[PDB]
Amino acid sequence: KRTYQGKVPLHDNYGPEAKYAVEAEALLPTTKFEEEIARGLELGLPGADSIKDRRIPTFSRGELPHFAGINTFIKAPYVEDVRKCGQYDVAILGAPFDGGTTYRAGTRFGPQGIRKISALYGTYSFELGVDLRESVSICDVGDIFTIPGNIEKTFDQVSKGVGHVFASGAFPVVLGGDHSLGFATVRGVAQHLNGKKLGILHFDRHVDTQDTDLDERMHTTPWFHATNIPNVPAKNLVQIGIGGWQAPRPGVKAGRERQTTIMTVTDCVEMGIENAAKQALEVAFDGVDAVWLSFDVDCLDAAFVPGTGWPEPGGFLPREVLKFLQIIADTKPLAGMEIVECAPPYDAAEITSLMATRVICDVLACQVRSGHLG
Amino acid sequence: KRTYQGKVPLHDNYGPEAKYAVEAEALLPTTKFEEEIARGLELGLPGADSIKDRRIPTFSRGELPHFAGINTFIKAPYVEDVRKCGQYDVAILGAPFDGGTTYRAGTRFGPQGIRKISALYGTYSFELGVDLRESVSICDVGDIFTIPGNIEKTFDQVSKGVGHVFASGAFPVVLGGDHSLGFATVRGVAQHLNGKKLGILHFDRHVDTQDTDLDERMHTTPWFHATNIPNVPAKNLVQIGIGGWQAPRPGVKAGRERQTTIMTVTDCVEMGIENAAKQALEVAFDGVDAVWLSFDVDCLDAAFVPGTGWPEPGGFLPREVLKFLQIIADTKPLAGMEIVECAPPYDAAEITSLMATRVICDVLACQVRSGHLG
Amino acid sequence: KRTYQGKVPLHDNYGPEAKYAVEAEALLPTTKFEEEIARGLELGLPGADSIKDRRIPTFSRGELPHFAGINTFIKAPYVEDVRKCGQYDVAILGAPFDGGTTYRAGTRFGPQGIRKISALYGTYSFELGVDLRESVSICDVGDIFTIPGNIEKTFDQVSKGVGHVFASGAFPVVLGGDHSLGFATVRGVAQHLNGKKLGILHFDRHVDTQDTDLDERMHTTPWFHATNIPNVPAKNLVQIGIGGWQAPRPGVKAGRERQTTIMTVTDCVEMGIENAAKQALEVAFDGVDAVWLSFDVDCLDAAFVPGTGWPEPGGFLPREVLKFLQIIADTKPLAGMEIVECAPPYDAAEITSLMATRVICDVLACQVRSGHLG
Amino acid sequence: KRTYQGKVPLHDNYGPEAKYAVEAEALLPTTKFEEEIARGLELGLPGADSIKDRRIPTFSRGELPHFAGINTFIKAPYVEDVRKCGQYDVAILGAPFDGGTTYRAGTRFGPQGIRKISALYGTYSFELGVDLRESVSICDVGDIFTIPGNIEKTFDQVSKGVGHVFASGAFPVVLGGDHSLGFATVRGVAQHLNGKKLGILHFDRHVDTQDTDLDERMHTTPWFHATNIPNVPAKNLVQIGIGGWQAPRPGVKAGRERQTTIMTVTDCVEMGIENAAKQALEVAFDGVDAVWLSFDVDCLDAAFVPGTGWPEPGGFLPREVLKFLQIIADTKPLAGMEIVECAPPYDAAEITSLMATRVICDVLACQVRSGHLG
Amino acid sequence: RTYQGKVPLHDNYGPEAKYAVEAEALLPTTKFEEEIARGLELGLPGADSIKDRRIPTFSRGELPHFAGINTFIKAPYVEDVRKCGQYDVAILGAPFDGGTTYRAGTRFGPQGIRKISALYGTYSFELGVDLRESVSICDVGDIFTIPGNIEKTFDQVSKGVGHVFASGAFPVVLGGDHSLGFATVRGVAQHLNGKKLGILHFDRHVDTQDTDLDERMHTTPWFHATNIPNVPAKNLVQIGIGGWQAPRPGVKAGRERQTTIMTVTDCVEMGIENAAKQALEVAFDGVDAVWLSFDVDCLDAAFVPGTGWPEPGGFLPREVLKFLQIIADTKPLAGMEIVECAPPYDAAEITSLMATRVICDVLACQVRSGHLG
Ligand SMILES: [Mn+2]
Ligand SMILES: [Mn+2]
Ligand SMILES: [Mn+2]
Ligand code: NI
Ligand code: NI
Ligand code: NI
Ligand code: NI
Ligand code: NI
């Protein structure tokens, strides 16, 4: 795994992860930092004469200040002409929709809330030893034009937009929006695999595998419909964290018949997260190369993700699920990801949007350092 | 314990709890589900012609939609004539009172907040393998007419109402309301045990065993006065989670003199929750058959139960206390239960009321699956 | 002055303002609407086949949906190269700073909160009869790189940035940020008036005219230092709304010595808003052509602007101050404006940022319809 | 009437209130300010060498900074020895109790919330022309030891403490706490009037004149029992603002039988606030020696006082009730006052506690400038 | 800390509970009785209908918890700061957020901590300590901070903290942003007579870069503190570093200066008892005086939502409280600061509650282990 390598001499009082991290930082380049500084001084003017740090412009035009600037995800460039998204390693897009919600709405603002709090972050992860600014190009293409009155029209919009981004070669990060969108995203991706199969790593307390809910393909039905697609095999759908009082019986039945794999929170913690991640990877990637990551923020215990429509006690703790994701994203390439169910109206201190931002950034960083992205 | 039995063939990549759960669901009946659907169409009219799912009425009458309907606890039937409560296996009642609180008030709304968020839940628990709708009859008899200006009059009201419900043969679930009510609930139950003894399983960070507080029998005093009752032995009062800066010295002294049993959070986690539950059960049931469960939401770490009047860091984590409760409620029958100190005005995303709802449902489900109820 | 003209025949049951408004709408062009629709489809792809309204792209690119898209002020174009701001009639810029606040901080997020809620608005005002999309070009140049640890360095940044925008010819709209910044904005503008004089229309409960506060030139001091500038005469500083318990005595004294004009809330409502506006305009523009509008959201009664660091009861009601602003902005050209003290952390449902947005838009609309802008 | 006097020359562009205010400030002394500065430097040490303002200590001791310091009401000295309260013109005391509430609790924190936000204020009112620091001595004696579980014991405590303060000669300002306490405060005052009679100016949407409520003397009953006291005549109870859906019929009946006077909000606004105040004063002071001011924050429209247990639409607007109170407190001496029903748990922006603080300071300032206090 | 057999107890108690129940039975009540007597004198005896004759008319001590003027745990306010040396412990606030690089609001940290601190009694069950009986605590209020000038604020904070530390009282500084750590350590170091000062720093952020937005903000305190001659960077132990907000220039400067860093995962995997041993060994190596700098952000965001720079993956409460207890039991501390609590982002006050708990547990362990009082 990731340990101190002896390339940069360091004293022995460091913890093991810290020692890896401090050395790793010393070996990272600064080229893209220098470019952003130079661009900011050109576009935002040199700072006033009383500013001692001559890297500081008059107008904010990069990372700093964190509390300033137009809110794109982690202050990535806004790509207005979406046909250019293939020029970037990673494309963030939003799917602001909550017509698939069976309890609270509000996740239509998921994309806005995630973008907003993502400004708090720098470009660099200490323990992962990655500086995204130096190692990958990220853009934000904004939001799908969703259709609140009609979930089927919304699916069509999301499949087309996500399919466009996936076909361009950029790694799509979809900010939801409720979990019904997982059907539309997977449907768009599967349309561009040339018949190859797509597995799914699904983090959620909810099984999301029933046919209809309140007479529509709501957030409780995405994987029933997705695994009806010929090149999306249900045997490669791995459902991580199922439990509680909101996994509906019709969804459990359909998943049994289709032979999805389920691992409860207790299953994963009792076996060890490292073992749980190995088992999930082996199933999801069995006989398939492309795997989609679908992360519902509700798989965390409610106290860590209060801003969601279907909160549940007894979920994962952050260090558990972040380790799980890091192992996944270090070990295998991913076709893309979506993070769904963040509902800012129920998230007063933005800690749910914060968690979602963290999940995205850890996944991207691990994809990068393990050679799967960039 | 609860493991896969081989009655329903299943592949080998399920986690152990998930494998048990998927099999268990396949063996559950659907009779009560079908009855509710049929009744809903009768009471709420057939749905409009454009509705494809003909199980859907015009007016919501039953579980769905979760965001709709009159808010009884888990949408159980309201039993206006409280003399009929004996017709049900379980009777939910509220005790909306906060005149016993020594810091923040607000738990007068505990019953309303618990009932409100209870709608989010289905009738079925995945990992416990139980569908309450199929296995037990539950009613909601509303609230005790509490007396905010007079804690003693409130006690008399609560003892009379709880005593009535307990004497009817229904399993009482009391929604608090502050912990002073634990005296009144136990006093009413003990009146109907034909002289038999009553033990108490008390989950809380606070001992609640002093004589008076601010000159009255407030939430720090219930078990001092409960264990003065001749058939309520203090040696069978087991206090789980005691710790922090709010266990008052006079309560500690009185509990010592009466020989109550205390296990701190750290005690329980270090020994192992399974071992802690075994020890608690042995002490509480030693020479008594009837045991009352008194659950203070404050026994959870503050972050999981922000909506309480006396929050404390360093409490249980949800998976710890839920396992504790599951073992208790699987191993022994309970005389009844109360869940106290939920204060919605300090609970923005309703995660405290959500925790309380989950505690009730897990306890009921374990009582049912283990043959103690329904 | 704005009444039905008889150019568009209308029935007689309309109210007078409605009759003006309905006729005015019928006379507005749609050219820029059509251009934005066409551009959106080009940049955002045609909508999916199931979408009937073929004006809808796959990706949101323009006004719709209001809940979608990157949050620039009223979804104006982000102008990354601030050297291009002179190409627009109006340039929005933020000054995210709260080192000048003497009670609550949080107005560093004022620009972000105003931009966010501004998406709720369309481009057209019913009762003012103005469609900004058709009549004026607006851009958003982002934020000044403020210096939270040093108010003087922040002033220097703000004066340089605002001076640049004002010098370019664009009408600057400065989103604050606390009222200390009033000094730095006026200082920047006055540097570019060719020695001509600058009056100030100041809406606030607070006089903001003392020398220092907590040893620095904080939000209680901006007009003391602004009127020390040779071409900023204190006799043309009109202070509208002063009152309550937070107008410090040293500020009252200095304003008296310098002969600023003050009208309290009660003065204005007692005389009539129309008369109050006449008096304020008469004084501010006496012997000067250029006047700066400095609007503190705290001049509204606290209930309308809870998200501010220095709230006060007894302020203006919205219809009173909006009428005041409309008369000002119809009657005379303005050199620019700033809206300060919006503090989103204290603004739960964003009604303070909503008020700020409304003030900007009414002022711009009145400048446009009266031939002072665009 | 308070008008410009021509004692301090001023230009003619000032509004009438502003002209009176600017002159009035120029005539106020600074003696007590200078004493506070000197005391602060002694007790808080001189500030660091880099501080230019040599009035600034190292430790905050006095008014500034407003965001700093121990929260007494408007940072008045805490008088720990309550036997010394007679040494002050005005004594603030809290009654933290909400056992008399018939809907929401939370007003037990009224005193704390009012004290907290009161730090925002200076010592001087612009439009009233009063500097409390220079003209009256104010102390804060903390809180009555209330008895949450027993409203009658709470009444006895409140009567004893308020009686003590009133008998000492200090003007009592009682921070509530629910309106049940109005009985206990008036009972304590009446005990020390030596047979002289007491009128009551009662601001509220609720009559608060029934016998019992939920079997106790709750906030709907204070004036039924107060006017049973021989020297508290019901004909001198003037009830200002009654209306809505929470004025109970038994209270209306009892007030009718006892011939209290009621003026609704619409009555007062339609007749004119100046005329309403004259009528209320006439009735309250008719044939009595002293009048008690009982102000329920609920008499304001809910939007201005969201933090209360019994909010109602259609109440007073701030400028209406502040004028009403100013006329009362300028025209007649008052025996004391209570401000009740502020409930901080429902007051997220603190604007309710702000309104309460403003009411107190306006009443005090008018008592002082009109020769009734100090 | 185990049951000692001094007070006979039955065998069904958990081990910590058994220690606790015995320990309470051995605590005195002298200072309790003095507080009761003082309250009746100063607040009057209660009304005749009150049966408990310890209850005054006016609240004047611990009770009721929801009542009274909010000093830290209702300790006496010491208006004359020249008298702070009469107390074992002196609480002071530093209400400043001009060092914050994202959210402000921590200027109210001191007010929010004082407010929620009223909920506590004077006694800890599992630590077996009654602070009212064993240590004298005062609250001297707040430093007069300077919101528009971070450097002037540092000078005020160094002068006030230095005064309190020089008086002999144990200073507890309520922040305020972590920029203030430079100023507090600077003030303490002036008064060590050349003696060296180590630092135990609980945080997700290294806080070791030179400037940030052109000033010495909350990301820079330890760069400038370890430039002080008697503040060795080798004795700066940084516990909890991780996430996406540990800036690269801070990591570089700490590497060059040879600070020690142990991530949350490092501590949890090695065991908190082992992590505390290692941290104490490094911090106290060749130094007697060690300062405790606790950023509330070292806890997972969900436990400390009221902060300007929250981060997932932090410590859980029982982990960090054990860590702190071992530190504060094993070694004396020169003082402590608790920083970054931002009440405007703390709706149910759970962040200020955590901060209060950290302070009380540290003080209680210092007392019971003979380092204070
Ligand atoms: Mn889910
Ligand atoms: Mn009322
Ligand atoms: Mn930190
Ligand atoms: Ni889901
Ligand atoms: Ni309890
Ligand atoms: Ni202002
Ligand atoms: Ni009332
Ligand atoms: Ni820090």
Coordinates of N, CA and C in Angstrom, one line a residue, chain A residues 155-284:
Chain A
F155 N -35.5 11.8 -17.1 CA -34.6 10.7 -17.4 C -34.0 10.9 -18.8
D156 N -34.8 11.2 -19.8 CA -34.3 11.4 -21.2 C -33.3 12.5 -21.2
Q157 N -33.5 13.6 -20.5 CA -32.5 14.7 -20.5 C -31.2 14.2 -19.9
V158 N -31.3 13.4 -18.8 CA -30.1 13.0 -18.0 C -29.3 12.0 -18.8
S159 N -30.0 11.0 -19.4 CA -29.3 10.0 -20.2 C -28.6 10.6 -21.4
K160 N -29.2 11.6 -22.0 CA -28.6 12.3 -23.2 C -27.3 13.1 -22.7
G161 N -27.5 13.9 -21.6 CA -26.3 14.7 -21.2 C -25.2 13.8 -20.6
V162 N -25.5 12.9 -19.8 CA -24.5 12.0 -19.2 C -23.8 11.2 -20.3
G163 N -24.7 10.6 -21.2 CA -24.1 9.9 -22.4 C -23.2 10.8 -23.2
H164 N -23.5 12.0 -23.4 CA -22.6 12.9 -24.1 C -21.3 13.1 -23.4
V165 N -21.3 13.3 -22.1 CA -20.1 13.5 -21.4 C -19.3 12.2 -21.4
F166 N -19.9 11.1 -21.2 CA -19.2 9.8 -21.1 C -18.6 9.5 -22.5
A167 N -19.3 9.7 -23.5 CA -18.8 9.4 -24.9 C -17.7 10.3 -25.3
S168 N -17.5 11.5 -24.6 CA -16.5 12.4 -24.9 C -15.1 12.0 -24.4
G169 N -15.1 11.0 -23.5 CA -13.8 10.5 -22.9 C -13.6 11.1 -21.5
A170 N -14.3 12.2 -21.1 CA -14.2 12.7 -19.8 C -14.8 11.8 -18.8
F171 N -14.2 11.7 -17.6 CA -14.8 11.0 -16.5 C -16.0 11.7 -15.9
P172 N -17.2 11.2 -16.0 CA -18.3 12.0 -15.5 C -18.5 11.9 -14.0
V173 N -18.7 13.0 -13.3 CA -19.1 13.1 -11.9 C -20.5 13.8 -11.9
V174 N -21.5 13.0 -11.6 CA -22.9 13.5 -11.6 C -23.3 13.9 -10.2
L175 N -23.7 15.1 -10.0 CA -24.2 15.6 -8.7 C -25.7 15.5 -8.8
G176 N -26.3 14.6 -8.0 CA -27.8 14.6 -7.9 C -28.3 15.5 -6.8
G177 N -29.6 15.6 -6.7 CA -30.6 14.8 -7.5 C -30.9 13.5 -6.8
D178 N -32.1 13.0 -7.0 CA -32.5 11.8 -6.2 C -32.0 10.6 -7.0
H179 N -32.1 9.4 -6.3 CA -31.5 8.2 -6.8 C -32.2 7.6 -8.0
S180 N -33.4 8.1 -8.3 CA -34.1 7.6 -9.6 C -33.1 7.9 -10.7
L181 N -32.3 9.0 -10.6 CA -31.4 9.3 -11.7 C -30.4 8.3 -12.0
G182 N -30.1 7.4 -11.1 CA -29.2 6.3 -11.4 C -29.6 5.4 -12.6
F183 N -30.9 5.3 -12.8 CA -31.3 4.6 -14.0 C -30.9 5.4 -15.2
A184 N -31.2 6.7 -15.2 CA -30.9 7.5 -16.4 C -29.4 7.6 -16.7
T185 N -28.6 7.7 -15.7 CA -27.2 7.8 -15.9 C -26.6 6.6 -16.5
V186 N -26.9 5.4 -15.8 CA -26.5 4.1 -16.3 C -27.0 3.9 -17.7
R187 N -28.2 4.2 -18.0 CA -28.8 4.0 -19.3 C -28.0 4.8 -20.4
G188 N -27.6 6.0 -20.1 CA -26.8 6.8 -21.0 C -25.4 6.2 -21.2
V189 N -24.8 5.8 -20.1 CA -23.4 5.2 -20.2 C -23.5 3.9 -21.0
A190 N -24.4 3.0 -20.7 CA -24.5 1.7 -21.3 C -24.7 1.8 -22.8
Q191 N -25.3 2.9 -23.3 CA -25.5 3.2 -24.7 C -24.2 3.4 -25.4
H192 N -23.1 3.7 -24.7 CA -21.9 4.0 -25.4 C -20.7 3.0 -25.0
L193 N -21.1 1.8 -24.7 CA -20.1 0.8 -24.3 C -19.9 -0.2 -25.5
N194 N -20.6 0.0 -26.6 CA -20.4 -0.9 -27.8 C -20.8 -2.3 -27.3
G195 N -21.8 -2.5 -26.5 CA -22.3 -3.8 -26.1 C -21.6 -4.5 -25.0
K196 N -20.5 -3.9 -24.5 CA -19.7 -4.4 -23.4 C -20.6 -4.3 -22.2
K197 N -20.4 -5.1 -21.1 CA -21.2 -5.1 -19.9 C -20.8 -4.0 -18.9
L198 N -21.7 -3.6 -18.1 CA -21.5 -2.5 -17.1 C -21.9 -3.1 -15.7
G199 N -20.9 -3.1 -14.8 CA -21.3 -3.4 -13.4 C -21.6 -2.1 -12.6
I200 N -22.1 -2.3 -11.4 CA -22.5 -1.2 -10.5 C -22.1 -1.4 -9.1
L201 N -21.4 -0.5 -8.5 CA -21.1 -0.5 -7.1 C -22.0 0.5 -6.5
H202 N -23.0 0.0 -5.7 CA -24.1 0.8 -5.2 C -24.0 0.9 -3.7
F203 N -23.8 2.2 -3.2 CA -23.7 2.4 -1.7 C -25.1 3.1 -1.3
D204 N -25.7 2.4 -0.4 CA -27.1 2.9 0.0 C -27.7 2.0 1.1
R205 N -28.5 2.6 1.9 CA -29.3 1.8 2.8 C -30.4 1.1 2.1
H206 N -30.8 1.8 0.9 CA -32.0 1.3 0.2 C -31.6 0.5 -1.0
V207 N -32.4 -0.5 -1.2 CA -32.2 -1.5 -2.3 C -32.5 -0.9 -3.7
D208 N -33.5 -0.1 -3.8 CA -33.7 0.7 -5.1 C -33.9 -0.3 -6.2
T209 N -34.6 -1.4 -6.0 CA -34.8 -2.4 -7.0 C -36.2 -2.9 -7.2
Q210 N -37.2 -2.0 -7.0 CA -38.7 -2.3 -7.2 C -39.0 -1.7 -8.6
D211 N -40.2 -2.1 -9.1 CA -40.6 -1.7 -10.5 C -41.2 -0.3 -10.4
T212 N -42.2 0.0 -9.7 CA -42.9 1.3 -9.6 C -43.2 1.7 -8.2
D213 N -43.2 3.0 -8.0 CA -43.5 3.5 -6.6 C -44.3 4.8 -6.9
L214 N -45.4 4.9 -6.2 CA -46.4 6.0 -6.5 C -46.6 6.1 -8.0
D215 N -46.7 4.9 -8.7 CA -47.1 4.8 -10.1 C -46.0 5.3 -11.1
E216 N -44.7 5.5 -10.6 CA -43.7 6.0 -11.5 C -42.3 5.3 -11.1
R217 N -41.3 5.5 -12.0 CA -40.0 4.9 -11.8 C -39.2 5.8 -10.8
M218 N -39.6 5.8 -9.6 CA -39.0 6.7 -8.6 C -37.7 6.2 -8.0
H219 N -37.1 6.9 -7.0 CA -35.7 6.5 -6.5 C -35.7 5.1 -5.9
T220 N -36.8 4.5 -5.7 CA -36.9 3.1 -5.2 C -36.8 2.1 -6.3
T221 N -36.7 2.5 -7.6 CA -36.8 1.7 -8.8 C -35.6 1.7 -9.8
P222 N -34.6 2.5 -9.6 CA -33.6 2.7 -10.7 C -32.9 1.5 -11.1
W223 N -32.6 0.6 -10.2 CA -31.8 -0.6 -10.5 C -32.7 -1.7 -11.1
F224 N -34.0 -1.7 -10.8 CA -34.9 -2.7 -11.5 C -34.8 -2.4 -13.0
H225 N -35.0 -1.1 -13.3 CA -35.0 -0.7 -14.8 C -33.6 -0.8 -15.4
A226 N -32.6 -0.4 -14.6 CA -31.2 -0.4 -15.2 C -30.8 -1.8 -15.6
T227 N -31.1 -2.8 -14.7 CA -30.7 -4.2 -14.9 C -31.6 -4.9 -15.9
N228 N -32.6 -4.3 -16.4 CA -33.4 -4.7 -17.6 C -32.6 -4.4 -18.9
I229 N -31.6 -3.5 -18.8 CA -30.9 -3.2 -20.0 C -30.0 -4.4 -20.4
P230 N -29.9 -4.8 -21.6 CA -29.2 -6.1 -21.9 C -27.8 -6.1 -21.5
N231 N -27.0 -5.0 -21.5 CA -25.6 -5.1 -21.1 C -25.4 -4.5 -19.7
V232 N -26.4 -4.5 -18.9 CA -26.2 -4.2 -17.5 C -26.7 -5.4 -16.6
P233 N -25.7 -6.3 -16.3 CA -26.1 -7.5 -15.6 C -26.3 -7.3 -14.1
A234 N -27.5 -7.8 -13.6 CA -27.9 -7.7 -12.2 C -26.9 -8.4 -11.3
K235 N -26.3 -9.5 -11.8 CA -25.3 -10.2 -11.0 C -24.1 -9.4 -10.7
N236 N -23.8 -8.3 -11.5 CA -22.7 -7.4 -11.2 C -23.2 -6.1 -10.5
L237 N -24.4 -6.1 -10.0 CA -24.8 -5.0 -9.1 C -24.6 -5.4 -7.6
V238 N -23.7 -4.7 -7.0 CA -23.2 -5.0 -5.6 C -23.8 -3.8 -4.8
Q239 N -24.6 -4.2 -3.8 CA -25.4 -3.3 -3.0 C -24.8 -3.2 -1.6
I240 N -24.2 -2.1 -1.2 CA -23.3 -2.0 -0.1 C -24.0 -1.1 0.9
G241 N -24.4 -1.7 2.1 CA -24.9 -0.9 3.2 C -26.4 -1.1 3.4
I242 N -27.1 -2.0 2.7 CA -28.5 -2.2 2.8 C -28.9 -2.5 4.2
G243 N -30.0 -1.8 4.7 CA -30.5 -2.1 6.0 C -31.5 -1.0 6.4
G244 N -32.1 -1.3 7.6 CA -33.0 -0.4 8.2 C -34.5 -0.7 7.9
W245 N -35.4 0.4 7.9 CA -36.8 0.2 7.8 C -37.3 0.8 6.5
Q246 N -36.4 1.0 5.5 CA -36.8 1.7 4.3 C -36.4 0.9 3.0
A247 N -36.0 -0.4 3.2 CA -35.7 -1.2 2.0 C -37.0 -2.0 1.7
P248 N -37.7 -1.6 0.7 CA -39.1 -2.1 0.5 C -39.0 -3.6 0.1
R249 N -40.0 -4.3 0.6 CA -40.1 -5.8 0.3 C -40.1 -6.1 -1.2
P250 N -40.9 -5.4 -2.0 CA -40.8 -5.6 -3.5 C -39.4 -5.5 -4.1
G251 N -38.7 -4.5 -3.5 CA -37.3 -4.3 -4.0 C -36.4 -5.5 -3.6
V252 N -36.6 -6.0 -2.4 CA -35.8 -7.1 -1.9 C -36.1 -8.3 -2.8
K253 N -37.4 -8.6 -3.0 CA -37.8 -9.7 -3.8 C -37.1 -9.7 -5.2
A254 N -37.3 -8.5 -5.9 CA -36.7 -8.5 -7.3 C -35.2 -8.6 -7.3
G255 N -34.5 -8.1 -6.3 CA -33.1 -8.3 -6.2 C -32.7 -9.7 -6.0
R256 N -33.5 -10.4 -5.2 CA -33.2 -11.8 -5.0 C -33.4 -12.6 -6.3
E257 N -34.5 -12.4 -7.0 CA -34.7 -13.1 -8.2 C -33.6 -12.8 -9.3
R258 N -33.1 -11.6 -9.3 CA -32.1 -11.2 -10.2 C -30.7 -11.5 -9.7
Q259 N -30.5 -11.9 -8.5 CA -29.2 -12.3 -7.9 C -28.2 -11.2 -7.8
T260 N -28.7 -10.0 -7.4 CA -27.8 -9.0 -7.0 C -27.0 -9.5 -5.7
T261 N -25.9 -8.8 -5.4 CA -25.2 -9.1 -4.1 C -25.5 -8.0 -3.1
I262 N -25.8 -8.3 -1.9 CA -26.0 -7.4 -0.8 C -25.1 -7.7 0.4
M263 N -24.6 -6.6 1.0 CA -23.7 -6.6 2.1 C -24.2 -5.5 3.0
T264 N -24.7 -5.9 4.2 CA -25.2 -4.9 5.1 C -24.0 -4.1 5.7
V265 N -24.4 -3.0 6.4 CA -23.3 -2.2 7.2 C -22.7 -3.2 8.2
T266 N -23.5 -3.9 8.9 CA -22.9 -4.8 9.9 C -22.0 -5.9 9.2
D267 N -22.5 -6.4 8.1 CA -21.6 -7.4 7.4 C -20.3 -6.8 7.1
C268 N -20.3 -5.5 6.5 CA -19.0 -4.9 6.1 C -18.1 -4.6 7.3
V269 N -18.6 -4.1 8.4 CA -17.8 -3.8 9.5 C -17.3 -5.0 10.2
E270 N -18.1 -6.0 10.3 CA -17.7 -7.3 11.0 C -16.6 -8.0 10.2
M271 N -16.7 -8.0 8.9 CA -15.7 -8.7 8.1 C -14.4 -7.9 7.9
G272 N -14.5 -6.6 8.2 CA -13.4 -5.7 7.9 C -13.6 -5.0 6.6
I273 N -13.4 -3.7 6.6 CA -13.7 -2.9 5.4 C -12.8 -3.3 4.3
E274 N -11.5 -3.7 4.6 CA -10.6 -4.1 3.5 C -11.1 -5.4 2.8
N275 N -11.6 -6.3 3.6 CA -12.2 -7.5 3.1 C -13.5 -7.3 2.4
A276 N -14.3 -6.3 2.9 CA -15.6 -6.0 2.2 C -15.3 -5.4 0.9
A277 N -14.3 -4.5 0.7 CA -14.0 -3.9 -0.5 C -13.5 -4.9 -1.5
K278 N -12.7 -5.9 -1.1 CA -12.2 -6.9 -2.0 C -13.4 -7.8 -2.5
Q279 N -14.3 -8.1 -1.7 CA -15.4 -8.9 -2.1 C -16.3 -8.2 -3.0
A280 N -16.6 -6.9 -2.7 CA -17.4 -6.1 -3.6 C -16.8 -5.9 -5.0
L281 N -15.5 -5.6 -5.0 CA -14.8 -5.5 -6.3 C -14.8 -6.8 -7.1
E282 N -14.6 -7.9 -6.4 CA -14.6 -9.2 -7.2 C -15.9 -9.5 -7.9
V283 N -17.0 -9.2 -7.2 CA -18.3 -9.4 -7.7 C -18.6 -8.4 -8.8
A284 N -18.4 -7.1 -8.6 CA -18.8 -6.1 -9.5 C -18.0 -6.2 -10.8

